[PDB]
Structure formats: C-alpha cells, structure tokens
Short mmCIF file of C-alpha atoms and ligand atoms in Angstrom, two decimals:
data_model
loop_
_atom_site.label_atom_id
_atom_site.label_comp_id
_atom_site.label_asym_id
_atom_site.label_seq_id
_atom_site.Cartn_x
_atom_site.Cartn_y
_atom_site.Cartn_z
CA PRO A 357 0.00 0.00 0.00
CA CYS A 358 0.87 3.72 0.12
CA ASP A 359 0.50 6.67 2.51
CA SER A 360 2.50 4.94 5.25
CA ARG A 361 3.13 8.09 7.35
CA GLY A 362 0.44 8.91 9.89
CA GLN A 363 2.71 10.78 12.31
CA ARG A 364 6.34 11.81 12.82
CA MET A 365 8.99 10.01 14.87
CA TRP A 366 11.94 12.09 13.66
CA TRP A 367 13.34 12.25 17.20
CA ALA A 368 14.61 8.66 16.99
CA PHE A 369 17.31 9.30 14.39
CA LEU A 370 18.24 12.66 15.93
CA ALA A 371 18.37 11.10 19.40
CA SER A 372 20.61 8.29 18.13
CA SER A 373 23.05 10.68 16.44
CA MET A 374 23.12 13.09 19.40
CA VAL A 375 23.58 10.31 21.95
CA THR A 376 26.43 8.83 19.90
CA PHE A 377 28.24 12.17 19.60
CA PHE A 378 27.65 13.23 23.21
CA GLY A 379 28.54 9.81 24.62
CA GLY A 380 31.79 9.91 22.69
CA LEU A 381 32.54 13.38 24.03
CA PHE A 382 31.62 12.38 27.59
CA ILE A 383 33.68 9.18 27.56
CA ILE A 384 36.68 11.06 26.14
CA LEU A 385 36.36 13.77 28.80
CA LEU A 386 35.96 11.13 31.52
CA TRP A 387 39.11 9.39 30.29
CA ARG A 388 40.97 12.71 30.34
CA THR A 389 39.78 13.53 33.87
CA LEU A 390 40.59 10.03 35.15
CA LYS A 391 44.10 10.36 33.71
CA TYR A 392 44.33 13.79 35.35
CA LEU A 393 43.11 12.41 38.70
CA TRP A 394 45.01 9.08 38.33
CA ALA B 922 -48.43 35.69 21.29
CA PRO B 923 -45.18 37.43 22.28
CA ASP B 924 -43.20 34.16 22.35
CA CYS B 925 -43.71 33.66 18.59
CA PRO B 926 -41.83 35.58 15.88
CA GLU B 927 -44.03 37.92 13.88
CA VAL B 928 -43.04 36.56 10.45
CA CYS B 929 -42.90 32.88 11.49
CA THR B 930 -45.60 30.33 12.30
CA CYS B 931 -45.86 28.69 15.73
CA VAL B 932 -48.00 25.89 17.15
CA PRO B 933 -48.72 24.98 20.79
CA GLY B 934 -45.91 23.00 22.37
CA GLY B 935 -43.02 25.32 21.51
CA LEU B 936 -42.64 24.26 17.87
CA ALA B 937 -41.79 27.20 15.59
CA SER B 938 -41.26 27.01 11.82
CA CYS B 939 -39.68 29.81 9.78
CA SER B 940 -39.22 27.92 6.49
CA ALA B 941 -40.04 29.40 3.08
CA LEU B 942 -39.72 32.98 4.36
CA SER B 943 -36.50 34.09 2.58
CA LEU B 944 -35.20 35.49 5.87
CA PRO B 945 -31.93 37.44 5.41
CA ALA B 946 -31.01 37.02 9.10
CA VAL B 947 -32.10 35.19 12.24
CA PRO B 948 -35.50 36.46 13.48
CA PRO B 949 -35.34 38.35 16.79
CA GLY B 950 -37.50 37.93 19.88
CA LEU B 951 -36.45 34.42 20.88
CA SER B 952 -38.27 32.97 23.89
CA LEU B 953 -37.75 30.11 26.33
CA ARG B 954 -41.23 28.76 25.48
CA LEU B 955 -40.08 27.52 22.06
CA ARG B 956 -38.63 23.99 22.03
CA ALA B 957 -37.97 23.48 18.29
CA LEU B 958 -37.00 26.02 15.63
CA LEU B 959 -37.02 25.58 11.85
CA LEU B 960 -34.90 27.87 9.67
CA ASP B 961 -34.27 25.88 6.47
CA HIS B 962 -34.39 27.32 2.94
CA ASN B 963 -33.34 30.83 3.98
CA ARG B 964 -30.51 33.19 3.06
CA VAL B 965 -28.83 33.68 6.46
CA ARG B 966 -25.29 33.53 5.11
CA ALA B 967 -23.65 35.02 8.22
CA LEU B 968 -24.51 33.96 11.77
CA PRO B 969 -23.83 36.73 14.32
CA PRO B 970 -22.43 35.76 17.74
CA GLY B 971 -25.17 34.99 20.24
CA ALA B 972 -27.84 34.96 17.54
CA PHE B 973 -29.93 32.32 19.34
CA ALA B 974 -29.69 34.05 22.73
CA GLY B 975 -32.77 33.76 24.90
CA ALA B 976 -34.06 30.37 23.74
CA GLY B 977 -32.03 28.30 26.18
CA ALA B 978 -34.75 25.63 26.33
CA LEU B 979 -34.68 24.96 22.57
CA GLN B 980 -34.17 21.31 21.63
CA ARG B 981 -34.14 21.14 17.81
CA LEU B 982 -32.44 23.67 15.53
CA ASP B 983 -32.42 23.41 11.73
CA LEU B 984 -30.24 25.44 9.36
CA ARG B 985 -30.24 23.23 6.25
CA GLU B 986 -30.01 24.83 2.79
CA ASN B 987 -29.26 28.28 4.22
CA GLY B 988 -25.90 28.93 2.54
CA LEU B 989 -23.95 29.11 5.80
CA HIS B 990 -20.25 29.82 5.28
CA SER B 991 -18.90 30.94 8.67
CA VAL B 992 -20.14 30.43 12.24
CA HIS B 993 -18.81 32.36 15.22
CA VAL B 994 -17.43 30.51 18.24
CA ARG B 995 -20.10 31.97 20.56
CA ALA B 996 -23.02 31.81 18.11
CA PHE B 997 -24.58 28.84 19.89
CA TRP B 998 -25.01 30.96 23.00
CA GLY B 999 -27.77 29.96 25.40
CA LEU B 1000 -28.33 26.50 23.93
CA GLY B 1001 -27.18 24.02 26.56
CA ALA B 1002 -30.45 22.14 25.99
CA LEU B 1003 -30.09 21.99 22.19
CA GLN B 1004 -30.14 18.39 20.98
CA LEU B 1005 -30.62 18.42 17.19
CA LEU B 1006 -28.51 20.45 14.75
CA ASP B 1007 -28.87 20.38 10.95
CA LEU B 1008 -26.04 22.36 9.33
CA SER B 1009 -26.10 20.14 6.23
CA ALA B 1010 -26.50 21.35 2.64
CA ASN B 1011 -24.40 24.45 3.32
CA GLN B 1012 -21.03 25.95 2.35
CA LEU B 1013 -19.17 25.57 5.66
CA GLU B 1014 -15.48 25.36 4.77
CA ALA B 1015 -14.04 25.77 8.29
CA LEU B 1016 -15.27 25.54 11.88
CA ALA B 1017 -13.82 27.49 14.78
CA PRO B 1018 -12.82 25.22 17.70
CA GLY B 1019 -15.11 25.37 20.71
CA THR B 1020 -18.21 26.24 18.67
CA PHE B 1021 -20.00 23.03 19.72
CA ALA B 1022 -18.53 22.93 23.24
CA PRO B 1023 -21.68 24.13 25.12
CA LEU B 1024 -23.79 21.52 23.27
CA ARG B 1025 -23.61 18.97 26.07
CA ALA B 1026 -27.01 17.49 25.11
CA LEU B 1027 -26.27 17.26 21.38
CA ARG B 1028 -27.50 13.98 19.89
CA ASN B 1029 -27.52 14.53 16.11
CA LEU B 1030 -25.10 16.80 14.22
CA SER B 1031 -25.49 17.25 10.46
CA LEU B 1032 -22.61 18.43 8.25
CA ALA B 1033 -23.59 16.83 4.94
CA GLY B 1034 -23.15 18.56 1.60
CA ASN B 1035 -20.59 20.96 3.07
CA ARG B 1036 -17.15 22.01 1.84
CA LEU B 1037 -15.35 21.14 5.10
CA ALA B 1038 -11.96 20.07 3.74
CA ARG B 1039 -10.65 19.14 7.20
CA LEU B 1040 -12.41 18.38 10.49
CA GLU B 1041 -10.21 18.69 13.56
CA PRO B 1042 -10.57 16.89 16.91
CA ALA B 1043 -10.86 20.23 18.72
CA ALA B 1044 -13.61 21.40 16.35
CA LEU B 1045 -16.10 18.89 17.76
CA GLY B 1046 -15.04 19.39 21.38
CA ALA B 1047 -16.26 17.30 24.29
CA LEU B 1048 -19.39 15.48 23.09
CA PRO B 1049 -20.14 12.67 25.57
CA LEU B 1050 -23.89 12.49 24.93
CA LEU B 1051 -23.55 12.45 21.13
CA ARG B 1052 -24.96 9.27 19.59
CA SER B 1053 -24.59 9.74 15.82
CA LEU B 1054 -22.82 11.83 13.20
CA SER B 1055 -23.23 12.56 9.49
CA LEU B 1056 -20.17 13.63 7.49
CA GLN B 1057 -21.23 12.58 3.99
CA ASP B 1058 -20.89 14.65 0.81
CA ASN B 1059 -17.89 16.53 2.21
CA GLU B 1060 -14.25 17.14 1.26
CA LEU B 1061 -12.81 15.30 4.29
CA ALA B 1062 -9.60 13.84 2.88
CA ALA B 1063 -8.76 11.97 6.10
CA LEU B 1064 -9.76 11.91 9.76
CA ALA B 1065 -6.97 12.98 12.09
CA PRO B 1066 -6.41 10.54 14.98
CA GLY B 1067 -8.07 11.53 18.24
CA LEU B 1068 -11.23 13.05 16.74
CA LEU B 1069 -13.29 9.98 17.69
CA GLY B 1070 -11.61 9.66 21.10
CA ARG B 1071 -14.08 12.10 22.70
CA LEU B 1072 -17.26 10.39 21.42
CA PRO B 1073 -17.82 7.36 23.68
CA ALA B 1074 -21.51 7.02 22.71
CA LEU B 1075 -20.99 7.36 18.94
CA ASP B 1076 -22.78 4.42 17.31
CA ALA B 1077 -23.82 5.70 13.85
CA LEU B 1078 -21.80 7.51 11.19
CA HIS B 1079 -22.18 8.37 7.50
CA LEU B 1080 -19.12 8.86 5.29
CA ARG B 1081 -20.41 8.37 1.73
CA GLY B 1082 -19.14 10.66 -1.01
CA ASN B 1083 -15.89 11.73 0.64
CA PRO B 1084 -12.32 11.86 -0.75
CA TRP B 1085 -11.00 9.21 1.64
CA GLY B 1086 -7.31 8.67 0.99
CA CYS B 1087 -6.76 5.07 2.06
CA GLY B 1088 -3.56 5.15 4.10
CA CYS B 1089 -2.40 5.07 7.72
CA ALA B 1090 -4.12 8.41 8.39
CA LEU B 1091 -7.48 6.61 8.60
CA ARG B 1092 -6.40 3.64 10.72
CA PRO B 1093 -8.38 5.03 13.71
CA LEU B 1094 -11.28 5.55 11.29
CA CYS B 1095 -11.19 1.86 10.34
CA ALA B 1096 -10.83 0.99 14.02
CA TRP B 1097 -14.30 2.41 14.69
CA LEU B 1098 -15.74 0.71 11.60
CA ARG B 1099 -14.45 -2.76 12.51
CA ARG B 1100 -16.30 -2.78 15.85
CA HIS B 1101 -19.32 -0.92 14.37
CA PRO B 1102 -20.70 -3.06 11.52
CA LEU B 1103 -21.97 -0.70 8.84
CA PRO B 1104 -25.00 -1.86 6.82
CA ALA B 1105 -24.09 -3.47 3.51
CA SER B 1106 -26.05 -0.80 1.64
CA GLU B 1107 -23.90 1.98 3.12
CA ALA B 1108 -20.68 -0.07 3.14
CA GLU B 1109 -20.86 -0.74 -0.61
CA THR B 1110 -21.09 3.03 -1.18
CA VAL B 1111 -17.92 3.76 0.85
CA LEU B 1112 -14.68 3.34 -1.11
CA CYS B 1113 -11.15 4.67 -1.39
CA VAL B 1114 -10.24 7.57 -3.67
CA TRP B 1115 -6.44 7.71 -3.82
CA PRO B 1116 -4.02 6.17 -4.57
CA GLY B 1117 -5.22 4.47 -7.75
CA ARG B 1118 -3.79 1.15 -6.58
CA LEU B 1119 -6.53 0.97 -3.92
CA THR B 1120 -9.49 2.12 -6.01
CA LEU B 1121 -12.86 0.36 -5.62
CA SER B 1122 -11.74 -0.99 -2.23
CA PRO B 1123 -14.22 -0.77 0.67
CA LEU B 1124 -12.86 0.63 3.92
CA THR B 1125 -14.30 -2.25 5.98
CA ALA B 1126 -12.26 -4.84 4.04
CA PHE B 1127 -8.93 -3.34 5.17
CA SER B 1128 -7.60 -5.36 8.10
CA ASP B 1129 -4.52 -5.11 10.31
CA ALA B 1130 -2.51 -7.31 7.93
CA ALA B 1131 -3.20 -4.91 5.05
CA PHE B 1132 -1.63 -2.07 7.08
CA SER B 1133 0.91 -3.87 9.25
CA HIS B 1134 3.58 -1.53 7.86
CA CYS B 1135 1.84 1.53 9.35
CA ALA B 1136 3.51 3.50 12.13
CA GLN B 1137 3.06 1.39 15.26
CA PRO B 1138 3.07 3.13 18.66
CA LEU B 1139 6.48 3.45 20.28
CA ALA B 1140 7.44 0.35 22.27
CA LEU B 1141 10.08 -0.16 24.96
CA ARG B 1142 12.34 -2.62 23.12
CA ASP B 1143 12.68 -0.52 19.96
CA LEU B 1144 13.05 2.55 22.18
CA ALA B 1145 16.24 1.06 23.62
CA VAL B 1146 17.40 -0.30 20.25
CA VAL B 1147 17.21 3.08 18.51
CA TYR B 1148 19.33 4.64 21.27
CA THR B 1149 21.87 1.81 21.39
CA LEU B 1150 22.25 1.09 17.66
CA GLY C 1463 37.37 3.47 12.59
CA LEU C 1464 40.63 3.46 10.63
CA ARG C 1465 40.90 7.24 11.05
CA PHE C 1466 40.17 6.98 14.78
CA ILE C 1467 42.92 4.38 15.25
CA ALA C 1468 45.42 6.68 13.52
CA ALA C 1469 44.12 9.85 15.20
CA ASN C 1470 46.66 11.68 17.36
CA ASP C 1471 44.30 13.51 19.74
CA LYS C 1472 40.99 11.74 20.32
CA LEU C 1473 39.05 14.73 21.67
CA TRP C 1474 40.01 17.01 18.78
CA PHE C 1475 39.39 14.23 16.27
CA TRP C 1476 35.87 13.84 17.70
CA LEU C 1477 35.19 17.49 16.78
CA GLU C 1478 36.32 17.27 13.15
CA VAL C 1479 33.76 17.97 10.43
CA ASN C 1480 34.10 14.51 8.86
CA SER C 1481 33.58 12.83 12.23
CA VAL C 1482 30.45 14.91 12.91
CA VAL C 1483 28.90 14.09 9.54
CA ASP C 1484 29.71 10.40 10.05
CA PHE C 1485 28.02 10.52 13.48
CA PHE C 1486 24.93 12.26 12.09
CA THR C 1487 24.78 10.21 8.88
CA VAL C 1488 25.51 6.53 9.59
CA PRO C 1489 23.43 5.80 12.76
CA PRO C 1490 20.27 7.33 11.23
CA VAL C 1491 20.57 5.06 8.18
CA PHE C 1492 21.17 2.09 10.48
CA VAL C 1493 18.01 2.95 12.42
CA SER C 1494 16.06 3.44 9.18
CA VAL C 1495 17.12 -0.02 8.01
CA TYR C 1496 16.17 -1.42 11.42
CA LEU C 1497 12.77 0.28 11.58
CA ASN C 1498 11.94 -0.08 7.85
CA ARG C 1499 11.20 3.66 7.80
CA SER C 1500 13.32 6.32 6.10
CA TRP C 1501 13.36 9.97 7.20
CA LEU C 1502 15.17 12.64 5.17
CA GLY C 1503 16.68 14.40 8.17
CA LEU C 1504 20.33 15.41 8.42
CA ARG C 1505 21.25 13.35 5.34
CA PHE C 1506 22.24 16.61 3.63
CA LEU C 1507 25.41 16.64 5.75
CA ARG C 1508 26.97 14.20 3.27
CA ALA C 1509 27.89 17.20 1.11
CA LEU C 1510 30.26 18.22 3.91
CA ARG C 1511 32.16 15.01 3.13
CA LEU C 1512 32.85 16.76 -0.20
CA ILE C 1513 35.23 19.07 1.70
CA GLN C 1514 37.85 16.34 2.21
CA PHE C 1515 38.94 16.25 -1.43
CA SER C 1516 42.10 18.39 -1.49
CA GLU C 1517 43.62 16.14 1.17
CA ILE C 1518 42.56 13.12 -0.89
CA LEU C 1519 44.28 14.52 -3.99
CA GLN C 1520 47.41 15.50 -2.04
CA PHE C 1521 47.69 12.01 -0.53
CA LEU C 1522 47.69 10.54 -4.06
CA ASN C 1523 50.44 13.01 -5.15
CA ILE C 1524 48.23 14.16 -8.06
CA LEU C 1525 47.87 17.67 -6.62
CA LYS C 1526 51.27 19.29 -6.03
CA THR C 1527 51.51 22.92 -7.19
CA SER C 1528 50.31 25.60 -4.79
CA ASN C 1529 47.90 27.32 -7.19
CA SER C 1530 45.99 24.14 -8.04
CA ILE C 1531 45.83 23.10 -4.37
CA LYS C 1532 44.33 26.46 -3.45
CA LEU C 1533 41.87 26.35 -6.36
CA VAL C 1534 40.68 22.86 -5.40
CA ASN C 1535 40.35 23.95 -1.75
CA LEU C 1536 38.27 27.00 -2.66
CA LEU C 1537 36.05 25.07 -5.09
CA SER C 1538 35.43 22.22 -2.65
CA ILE C 1539 34.64 24.55 0.26
CA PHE C 1540 32.31 26.69 -1.85
CA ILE C 1541 30.39 23.79 -3.39
CA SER C 1542 30.13 21.89 -0.09
CA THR C 1543 28.85 24.92 1.82
CA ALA D 79 -38.54 -1.42 -4.02
CA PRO D 80 -34.99 -1.37 -2.64
CA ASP D 81 -33.41 -1.01 -6.10
CA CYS D 82 -35.03 2.43 -6.58
CA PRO D 83 -33.82 5.63 -4.90
CA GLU D 84 -36.25 7.02 -2.34
CA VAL D 85 -36.42 10.53 -3.83
CA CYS D 86 -36.37 9.42 -7.49
CA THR D 87 -38.97 7.78 -9.73
CA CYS D 88 -38.41 4.36 -11.30
CA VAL D 89 -40.32 2.28 -13.84
CA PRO D 90 -40.06 -1.44 -14.64
CA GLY D 91 -37.13 -2.24 -16.90
CA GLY D 92 -34.39 -0.50 -14.92
CA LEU D 93 -35.17 3.06 -16.04
CA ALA D 94 -34.73 5.60 -13.23
CA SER D 95 -35.31 9.35 -13.51
CA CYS D 96 -34.12 11.86 -10.92
CA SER D 97 -34.80 15.07 -12.88
CA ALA D 98 -36.42 18.16 -11.34
CA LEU D 99 -35.38 17.17 -7.81
CA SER D 100 -32.70 19.83 -7.07
CA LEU D 101 -30.38 17.10 -5.79
CA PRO D 102 -27.20 18.55 -4.21
CA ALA D 103 -25.31 15.26 -4.70
CA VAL D 104 -25.63 11.87 -6.38
CA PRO D 105 -28.39 9.77 -4.73
CA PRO D 106 -27.10 6.72 -2.85
CA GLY D 107 -28.30 3.13 -3.00
CA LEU D 108 -27.38 2.32 -6.59
CA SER D 109 -28.39 -1.13 -7.81
CA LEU D 110 -27.50 -3.43 -10.69
CA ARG D 111 -31.19 -3.66 -11.66
CA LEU D 112 -31.20 -0.10 -13.05
CA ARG D 113 -30.19 0.20 -16.71
CA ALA D 114 -30.69 3.94 -17.33
CA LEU D 115 -30.27 6.87 -14.93
CA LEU D 116 -31.42 10.47 -15.39
CA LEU D 117 -29.79 13.25 -13.37
CA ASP D 118 -30.31 16.41 -15.44
CA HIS D 119 -31.29 19.82 -14.03
CA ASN D 120 -29.63 19.25 -10.65
CA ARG D 121 -26.95 21.03 -8.61
CA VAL D 122 -24.33 18.27 -8.28
CA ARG D 123 -21.36 20.57 -8.82
CA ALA D 124 -18.76 18.11 -7.50
CA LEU D 125 -18.67 14.43 -8.43
CA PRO D 126 -17.00 12.29 -5.73
CA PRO D 127 -14.79 9.37 -6.82
CA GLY D 128 -16.76 6.17 -7.27
CA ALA D 129 -20.08 8.00 -7.03
CA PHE D 130 -21.82 5.57 -9.41
CA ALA D 131 -20.45 2.47 -7.68
CA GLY D 132 -22.79 -0.51 -7.61
CA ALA D 133 -24.69 0.11 -10.86
CA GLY D 134 -22.28 -1.74 -13.11
CA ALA D 135 -25.10 -2.75 -15.47
CA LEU D 136 -26.17 0.84 -16.18
CA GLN D 137 -26.33 1.74 -19.87
CA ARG D 138 -27.42 5.40 -20.07
CA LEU D 139 -26.19 8.17 -17.77
CA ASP D 140 -27.29 11.81 -18.06
CA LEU D 141 -25.69 14.78 -16.29
CA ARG D 142 -26.81 17.67 -18.51
CA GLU D 143 -27.41 21.11 -16.98
CA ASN D 144 -25.93 20.08 -13.62
CA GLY D 145 -23.15 22.68 -13.35
CA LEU D 146 -20.34 20.12 -13.36
CA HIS D 147 -16.89 21.70 -13.07
CA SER D 148 -14.51 18.87 -12.07
CA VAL D 149 -14.73 15.08 -12.41
CA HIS D 150 -12.41 12.68 -10.62
CA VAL D 151 -10.42 10.10 -12.58
CA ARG D 152 -12.15 7.18 -10.82
CA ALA D 153 -15.56 8.85 -10.44
CA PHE D 154 -17.52 6.82 -12.99
CA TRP D 155 -16.51 3.69 -11.10
CA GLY D 156 -18.21 0.41 -11.94
CA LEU D 157 -19.61 1.40 -15.33
CA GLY D 158 -17.98 -0.89 -17.90
CA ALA D 159 -21.45 -1.35 -19.42
CA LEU D 160 -22.21 2.39 -19.63
CA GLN D 161 -22.98 3.40 -23.22
CA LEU D 162 -24.52 6.89 -23.16
CA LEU D 163 -23.00 9.91 -21.40
CA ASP D 164 -24.44 13.45 -21.46
CA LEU D 165 -22.01 15.88 -19.82
CA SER D 166 -23.18 18.74 -22.04
CA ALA D 167 -24.47 22.12 -20.82
CA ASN D 168 -21.96 22.18 -17.96
CA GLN D 169 -18.87 24.12 -16.85
CA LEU D 170 -16.19 21.46 -17.41
CA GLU D 171 -12.95 23.36 -18.03
CA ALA D 172 -10.53 20.42 -17.74
CA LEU D 173 -10.70 16.62 -17.80
C1 PGW E 2786 30.30 5.50 22.43
C2 PGW E 2786 30.84 6.20 21.22
C3 PGW E 2786 32.30 5.95 20.98
C4 PGW E 2786 33.19 6.21 22.19
C5 PGW E 2786 34.66 6.05 21.91
C6 PGW E 2786 35.53 6.04 23.15
C7 PGW E 2786 37.00 5.78 22.87
C8 PGW E 2786 37.75 5.38 24.10
C9 PGW E 2786 38.46 6.51 24.79
O1 PGW E 2786 37.92 7.48 25.25
O2 PGW E 2786 39.78 6.32 24.86
C10 PGW E 2786 40.61 6.80 23.76
C11 PGW E 2786 41.86 5.96 23.67
O3 PGW E 2786 41.49 4.60 23.38
C12 PGW E 2786 42.48 3.72 23.33
O4 PGW E 2786 43.60 3.98 23.67
C13 PGW E 2786 42.00 2.40 22.79
C14 PGW E 2786 41.37 2.51 21.44
C15 PGW E 2786 40.05 1.77 21.37
C16 PGW E 2786 39.12 2.07 22.51
C17 PGW E 2786 37.78 1.38 22.41
C18 PGW E 2786 37.03 1.30 23.71
C19 PGW E 2786 35.67 0.66 23.61
C20 PGW E 2786 35.02 0.39 24.94
C21 PGW E 2786 35.04 1.56 25.89
C22 PGW E 2786 34.27 1.34 27.17
C23 PGW E 2786 32.79 1.18 26.97
C24 PGW E 2786 32.10 2.39 26.39
C25 PGW E 2786 30.61 2.23 26.23
C26 PGW E 2786 40.91 8.26 23.99
O5 PGW E 2786 41.94 8.34 25.00
P1 PGW E 2786 42.52 9.78 25.40
O6 PGW E 2786 41.34 10.70 25.52
O7 PGW E 2786 43.49 9.64 26.54
O8 PGW E 2786 43.38 10.18 24.10
C27 PGW E 2786 44.18 11.39 24.11
C28 PGW E 2786 45.26 11.27 23.07
O9 PGW E 2786 45.95 12.51 22.95
C29 PGW E 2786 46.24 10.15 23.35
O10 PGW E 2786 47.13 9.95 22.26
#
C-alpha cells in the first residue's frame, strides 16, 4: 500500500546521532579527567 | 403571542417554523417557550455571535439549505439544551474550535453537503452524549487521529461521497468501523479515492494485515534499540 | 574506525567535520534499516564530506603545485557549503 | 422497491429518472437492476470518486445542466457497461 506516514517520529534518528556524539565526548572527557586524577 | 416571531408560524408546544420565508437574518425575539425552531431554505449567510440568545430551552435547531459559510465561536449561545442540529446542505469550509462545546445534550449533528476540507478533533469538542454523526458529501480527505476519542456514545456515522485517501491516516477511522458493523447498503457506497492502486476498495475490508507496515506506537524494546544502535 | 585508530588527539578528532557528519549520517541510516522507515533528516550533511577532497588529492600526489591546491580547496569549500 | 432511490422515480425495466429534484449530490443506494439513470437539471457541482459504484449494469447516464466543473479520474466507477453519457451544458474546463 501507500501513505504509510500517519505521524512523525523524527526524534529517533536525531536522538541516536546526538547520543552517539555526546557519549563519545563524555567518555573522552571522563578518560581525560581520570588520567588527570590518576 | 409574544413568544412567537411575527413573520414565522408557531404551534402549541413550543414548535416554531420559519421555512419558506427568505429570511436574510435570524429572526429576533427568541423565547424560552419555544422547544424546536425551523430555519431551512433561507438566506442567512452570516450567523452573528449569540444569535440564538434567549431560547435556552430549545431542543431542535435546523439550518439546512441556508448557505452558511462561517459560524462564530459563541453563536450557539444559550443553547445548553439543544439536541438536534442540521447544518447540512451548506457551504461551511471551516469551523472554529469550541463552537460546539456548550452543546452537552447534542445527539444529532449534520454536516452533509458541506465544503469542510478538514475536520479537527478540537472542532467537535467534548461530546459525551452524542450518539450519531453525518459527514457525507464533504471534502474530508482523512480523519486525524483523536477526533473519535471524545465520542464514547458514537454508534452511527455516515461517510459516503468523501475523498477518503486510504492510508495510515485513517487507521483510527477503520478501528471504529471494525467494531461498528456498517449496513451493507452503506458499506458498498464507501470506497477509497487515492491512490489508484486501492481504487474500488471498501474501507471495511482493510484489516490489520493490510496495514501492518503503518507507524506502530512506540514500544520499549525498539526505544532502547534506537538509542543503542 | 581506521581514522580513529590513527588519530593523534581523540578529543580534537571527535570534533572534526568529517567525524560529525559520520556521526549524524551513519546511525540514522542504520536505524532506518532497522525500523523499515526512512526519514530525510540530516542526510544533507553528506555534502560536507565533499570538503575532504584536497587532502585526498594531495595524498595521491596528483595535486602538487600551490595554485591548483588552493583552487581545489576553494572550489570544494564553496560547493560543499 | 430497494433497487429504486427514495427521492427518485423508477419504472419497470431498470429506467430511473431523478430530474427536477434539485439534488445537491448523487443519490445513494445504486443497484444493478437499473439500466438507465437520469440526473439532469440538478446542482451536483462536485462528483465524488466512485459515485456511481454498484450500478455496473447501467447503460445510459445523463448529467446535462448540472453545473459540473470537475470530475475525478475514478468517479464513474463500476460502469464498464455504460454506453450513453451526457455531460453537455456544464462548466467542465478540464478533464
Ligand atoms: C560511544 C561512542 C564511541 C566512544 C569512543 C571512546 C573511545 C575510548 C576513549 O575514550 O579512549 C581513547 C583511547 O582509546 C584507546 O587507547 C584504545 C582505542 C580503542 C578504545 C575502544 C574502547 C571501547 C570500549 C570503551 C568502554 C565502553 C564504552 C561504552 C581516547 O583516550 P585519550 O582521551 O586519553 O586520548 C588522548 C590522546 O591525545 C592520546 O594519544
């Protein structure tokens, strides 16, 4: 069939990309702080 | 009698008829003694706010074939007891939300033969006592989800002659139809319009398997998978 | 992944333009394949990948002279933006 | 009889006439028993898709002097047997 879009769930892709980027940043910063604080 | 309009005809019991009078506007001097009012076949194109003020005890109101094109939000003032509305055979292209909110005792609402391209959930408002609806001969492309969620007592509906686009937008519409068996006479007259691949297809024959690819509600497994992928 | 292994500073590699477009381009397509539903969201960021062309040409030793390097840089930046 | 529209007049042989009724839309309840349908001198400006569904055995259809202005691609649904069409005296600007 056609007309398969009743509503929008655009947040899923945006949430995935943002969580990937921010988790990478947070884990890198945590590694840096742990190295700083031994 | 003072409770009867001068140009209209009234009978004992509060039944007033103003048909075949070519009235350019709503007659004044409304009274609480009138229970039913007839106003069909007139030329009241514009309805002023609070036009029906005074007749709070009215039960039946008719405005068919009057060329209505715009109704104010507070036009139905003083009509908490109004039960029957006939706005069909008019040129209503849009309805202001909250217009039908005071109609707590509404039982029949007519919107046939109108040019209402879209009907919104907030346009109907809270209608718990409503039992039936008529939306035939309109330009309703699709019913937005949630419109039927505020009509618990809705048992009858007419949808013939509408540009129903058979997709996922009318899945809630089919949900009502599955549990409300439409008569075969009316069901055979209800069909899809677009796309052409689904022409001549009745709306009652579309099951869950036909639209399993539609947007399902968000779950908890996929919610974690989309984050973790 | 190959670039990340060879990256000198991890934090400043995370903030590069190519890394950002990879982050905002690949996971959405993975989710779209998973959910059988495609959304044209930030897919336009792929044009930013067009920026990393002068470095590609310089790695291959095709692009040597200063004028041509600068011309390719300007053209790539302009078209990508 | 169920095969005849309530507001229209029908005669034996499947001939139905709906003229001089000021119909704002196509009457419902079409049946295969009707062979000819008359709809002239009405005000059916818009023709919904699949309006004539059900009367696949109809042979003659008339829509003269009805103020038609736009007809859907799938409107004359279920009419493979239709032979006579009268769209004249209307306002059809495009098909
Ligand atoms: C999630 C998205 C991706 C997150 C990626 C996290 C990568 C892991 C991480 O933060 O460690 C990196 C090093 O890894 C290395 O040595 C090893 C390279 C591969 C590391 C892979 C770790 C995966 C598991 C990690 C735990 C579970 C996370 C959930 C960075 O180190 P640092 O900032 O000191 O560099 C400073 C530089 O100047 C040193 O030359």
